[PDB]
Amino acid sequence: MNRHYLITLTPMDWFFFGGERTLDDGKSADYISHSNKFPQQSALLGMIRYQLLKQHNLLSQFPYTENKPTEKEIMKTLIGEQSFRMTERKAKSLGLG
RNA sequence: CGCCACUUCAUGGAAAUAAAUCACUCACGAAUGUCUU
Structure with a gap:
Protein backbone atom coordinates (compact mmCIF):
# COMPACT_ATOMS: atom_id res chain seq x y z
CA MET A 1 0.00 0.00 0.00
CA SER A 35 29.16 23.07 -9.46
CA ASN A 36 27.26 22.41 -6.26
CA LYS A 37 28.40 19.26 -4.50
CA PHE A 38 24.77 18.18 -4.02
CA PRO A 39 21.62 18.57 -6.11
CA GLN A 40 18.52 20.24 -4.77
CA GLN A 41 15.72 18.03 -3.49
CA SER A 42 13.69 19.53 -6.34
CA ALA A 43 16.12 17.84 -8.73
CA LEU A 44 15.58 14.49 -7.00
CA LEU A 45 11.80 14.88 -7.10
CA GLY A 46 11.87 15.89 -10.77
CA MET A 47 14.09 12.91 -11.57
CA ILE A 48 11.58 10.61 -9.87
CA ARG A 49 8.68 12.20 -11.78
CA TYR A 50 10.54 11.97 -15.10
CA GLN A 51 11.45 8.32 -14.56
CA LEU A 52 7.86 7.50 -13.57
CA LEU A 53 6.68 9.20 -16.77
CA LYS A 54 9.26 7.14 -18.67
CA GLN A 55 8.07 3.84 -17.18
CA HIS A 56 4.44 4.66 -18.02
CA ASN A 57 5.10 5.98 -21.51
CA LEU A 58 3.56 9.45 -21.14
CA LEU A 59 6.21 11.94 -22.24
CA SER A 60 6.12 15.43 -23.73
CA GLN A 61 7.69 14.98 -27.18
CA PHE A 62 8.21 17.44 -30.11
CA PRO A 63 6.80 20.98 -30.29
CA TYR A 64 3.62 21.30 -28.25
CA THR A 65 0.40 19.40 -27.55
CA GLU A 66 -2.45 19.19 -25.02
CA ASN A 67 -1.91 15.56 -23.97
CA LYS A 68 -5.39 14.04 -24.27
CA PRO A 69 -7.12 15.18 -21.04
CA THR A 70 -7.67 11.58 -19.90
CA GLU A 71 -3.89 11.25 -20.13
CA LYS A 72 -3.73 14.57 -18.27
CA GLU A 73 -5.76 13.00 -15.45
CA ILE A 74 -3.64 9.83 -15.34
CA MET A 75 -0.46 11.93 -15.32
CA LYS A 76 -1.92 14.06 -12.52
CA THR A 77 -2.66 11.02 -10.39
CA LEU A 78 0.77 9.56 -11.21
CA ILE A 79 3.18 12.48 -10.70
CA GLY A 80 0.91 15.21 -9.36
CA GLU A 81 -0.23 18.30 -11.22
CA GLN A 82 2.56 20.67 -10.20
CA SER A 83 6.29 20.88 -9.55
CA PHE A 84 8.08 21.59 -6.28
CA ARG A 85 7.43 25.16 -5.14
CA MET A 86 8.08 26.78 -1.78
CA THR A 87 4.75 28.62 -1.88
CA GLU A 88 3.13 25.48 -0.43
CA ARG A 89 5.88 25.02 2.16
CA LYS A 90 3.39 24.62 5.03
CA ALA A 91 1.11 22.16 3.22
CA LYS A 92 0.47 18.96 5.15
CA SER A 93 0.85 16.84 2.00
CA LEU A 94 3.46 16.73 -0.75
CA GLY A 95 0.76 17.50 -3.31
CA LEU A 96 2.38 15.15 -5.83
CA GLY A 97 1.03 11.86 -7.15
C1' C B 1 155.17 6.35 -75.70
C1' G B 2 151.82 2.47 -76.47
C1' C B 3 147.41 0.03 -74.63
C1' C B 4 143.30 -0.20 -71.16
C1' A B 5 138.38 0.83 -67.47
C1' C B 6 135.72 -0.42 -63.24
C1' U B 7 132.47 1.31 -58.74
C1' U B 8 128.34 3.92 -56.34
C1' C B 9 121.98 5.47 -57.79
C1' A B 10 118.14 7.72 -50.41
C1' U B 11 118.46 7.46 -46.10
C1' G B 12 117.07 9.86 -41.34
C1' G B 13 113.27 13.93 -39.23
C1' A B 14 108.54 16.56 -39.40
C1' A B 15 102.79 13.28 -41.30
C1' A B 16 99.03 18.28 -38.81
C1' U B 17 98.99 22.36 -34.82
C1' A B 18 96.07 26.47 -32.29
C1' A B 19 91.44 30.16 -32.47
C1' A B 20 86.34 30.41 -32.90
C1' U B 21 81.72 25.24 -31.25
C1' C B 22 76.59 29.14 -32.49
C1' A B 23 75.59 34.54 -31.60
C1' C B 24 71.20 38.41 -31.65
C1' U B 25 65.89 38.98 -32.19
C1' C B 26 61.13 37.26 -31.47
C1' A B 27 59.41 33.02 -26.16
C1' C B 28 53.17 33.95 -27.93
C1' G B 29 50.18 38.61 -30.50
C1' A B 30 44.68 39.72 -31.65
C1' A B 31 39.25 38.08 -30.85
C1' U B 32 35.88 35.82 -27.22
C1' G B 33 35.42 37.01 -20.30
C1' U B 34 29.61 34.43 -21.79
C1' C B 35 25.65 33.95 -25.66
C1' U B 36 20.53 31.90 -27.46
C1' U B 37 15.85 29.70 -25.58
Whole structure:
Protein backbone atom coordinates (compact mmCIF):
# COMPACT_ATOMS: atom_id res chain seq x y z
CA MET A 1 0.00 0.00 0.00
CA ASN A 2 2.99 2.27 0.75
CA ARG A 3 6.22 0.73 -0.52
CA HIS A 4 9.56 2.26 0.41
CA TYR A 5 12.64 2.04 -1.82
CA LEU A 6 16.29 2.95 -1.44
CA ILE A 7 17.76 4.57 -4.56
CA THR A 8 21.52 4.69 -5.06
CA LEU A 9 22.96 6.97 -7.75
CA THR A 10 26.34 6.07 -9.25
CA PRO A 11 28.06 8.85 -11.25
CA MET A 12 29.01 7.36 -14.60
CA ASP A 13 30.83 10.54 -15.68
CA TRP A 14 31.60 14.05 -14.46
CA PHE A 15 28.47 15.67 -13.05
CA PHE A 16 27.45 19.31 -12.68
CA PHE A 17 24.82 20.69 -10.31
CA GLY A 18 23.74 24.23 -11.10
CA GLY A 19 24.23 27.25 -8.87
CA GLU A 20 22.64 30.68 -8.65
CA ARG A 21 23.90 31.22 -12.23
CA THR A 22 24.63 34.82 -11.20
CA LEU A 23 25.41 37.14 -8.31
CA ASP A 24 22.85 39.49 -9.92
CA ASP A 25 20.06 39.34 -12.50
CA GLY A 26 18.96 40.74 -15.86
CA LYS A 27 20.64 39.12 -18.85
CA SER A 28 24.12 38.38 -17.44
CA ALA A 29 25.36 34.80 -17.29
CA ASP A 30 28.41 33.67 -15.24
CA TYR A 31 31.71 33.23 -17.04
CA ILE A 32 32.82 30.83 -14.29
CA SER A 33 30.03 28.34 -13.61
CA HIS A 34 30.58 26.48 -10.34
CA SER A 35 29.16 23.07 -9.46
CA ASN A 36 27.26 22.41 -6.26
CA LYS A 37 28.40 19.26 -4.50
CA PHE A 38 24.77 18.18 -4.02
CA PRO A 39 21.62 18.57 -6.11
CA GLN A 40 18.52 20.24 -4.77
CA GLN A 41 15.72 18.03 -3.49
CA SER A 42 13.69 19.53 -6.34
CA ALA A 43 16.12 17.84 -8.73
CA LEU A 44 15.58 14.49 -7.00
CA LEU A 45 11.80 14.88 -7.10
CA GLY A 46 11.87 15.89 -10.77
CA MET A 47 14.09 12.91 -11.57
CA ILE A 48 11.58 10.61 -9.87
CA ARG A 49 8.68 12.20 -11.78
CA TYR A 50 10.54 11.97 -15.10
CA GLN A 51 11.45 8.32 -14.56
CA LEU A 52 7.86 7.50 -13.57
CA LEU A 53 6.68 9.20 -16.77
CA LYS A 54 9.26 7.14 -18.67
CA GLN A 55 8.07 3.84 -17.18
CA HIS A 56 4.44 4.66 -18.02
CA ASN A 57 5.10 5.98 -21.51
CA LEU A 58 3.56 9.45 -21.14
CA LEU A 59 6.21 11.94 -22.24
CA SER A 60 6.12 15.43 -23.73
CA GLN A 61 7.69 14.98 -27.18
CA PHE A 62 8.21 17.44 -30.11
CA PRO A 63 6.80 20.98 -30.29
CA TYR A 64 3.62 21.30 -28.25
CA THR A 65 0.40 19.40 -27.55
CA GLU A 66 -2.45 19.19 -25.02
CA ASN A 67 -1.91 15.56 -23.97
CA LYS A 68 -5.39 14.04 -24.27
CA PRO A 69 -7.12 15.18 -21.04
CA THR A 70 -7.67 11.58 -19.90
CA GLU A 71 -3.89 11.25 -20.13
CA LYS A 72 -3.73 14.57 -18.27
CA GLU A 73 -5.76 13.00 -15.45
CA ILE A 74 -3.64 9.83 -15.34
CA MET A 75 -0.46 11.93 -15.32
CA LYS A 76 -1.92 14.06 -12.52
CA THR A 77 -2.66 11.02 -10.39
CA LEU A 78 0.77 9.56 -11.21
CA ILE A 79 3.18 12.48 -10.70
CA GLY A 80 0.91 15.21 -9.36
CA GLU A 81 -0.23 18.30 -11.22
CA GLN A 82 2.56 20.67 -10.20
CA SER A 83 6.29 20.88 -9.55
CA PHE A 84 8.08 21.59 -6.28
CA ARG A 85 7.43 25.16 -5.14
CA MET A 86 8.08 26.78 -1.78
CA THR A 87 4.75 28.62 -1.88
CA GLU A 88 3.13 25.48 -0.43
CA ARG A 89 5.88 25.02 2.16
CA LYS A 90 3.39 24.62 5.03
CA ALA A 91 1.11 22.16 3.22
CA LYS A 92 0.47 18.96 5.15
CA SER A 93 0.85 16.84 2.00
CA LEU A 94 3.46 16.73 -0.75
CA GLY A 95 0.76 17.50 -3.31
CA LEU A 96 2.38 15.15 -5.83
CA GLY A 97 1.03 11.86 -7.15
C1' C B 1 155.17 6.35 -75.70
C1' G B 2 151.82 2.47 -76.47
C1' C B 3 147.41 0.03 -74.63
C1' C B 4 143.30 -0.20 -71.16
C1' A B 5 138.38 0.83 -67.47
C1' C B 6 135.72 -0.42 -63.24
C1' U B 7 132.47 1.31 -58.74
C1' U B 8 128.34 3.92 -56.34
C1' C B 9 121.98 5.47 -57.79
C1' A B 10 118.14 7.72 -50.41
C1' U B 11 118.46 7.46 -46.10
C1' G B 12 117.07 9.86 -41.34
C1' G B 13 113.27 13.93 -39.23
C1' A B 14 108.54 16.56 -39.40
C1' A B 15 102.79 13.28 -41.30
C1' A B 16 99.03 18.28 -38.81
C1' U B 17 98.99 22.36 -34.82
C1' A B 18 96.07 26.47 -32.29
C1' A B 19 91.44 30.16 -32.47
C1' A B 20 86.34 30.41 -32.90
C1' U B 21 81.72 25.24 -31.25
C1' C B 22 76.59 29.14 -32.49
C1' A B 23 75.59 34.54 -31.60
C1' C B 24 71.20 38.41 -31.65
C1' U B 25 65.89 38.98 -32.19
C1' C B 26 61.13 37.26 -31.47
C1' A B 27 59.41 33.02 -26.16
C1' C B 28 53.17 33.95 -27.93
C1' G B 29 50.18 38.61 -30.50
C1' A B 30 44.68 39.72 -31.65
C1' A B 31 39.25 38.08 -30.85
C1' U B 32 35.88 35.82 -27.22
C1' G B 33 35.42 37.01 -20.30
C1' U B 34 29.61 34.43 -21.79
C1' C B 35 25.65 33.95 -25.66
C1' U B 36 20.53 31.90 -27.46
C1' U B 37 15.85 29.70 -25.58
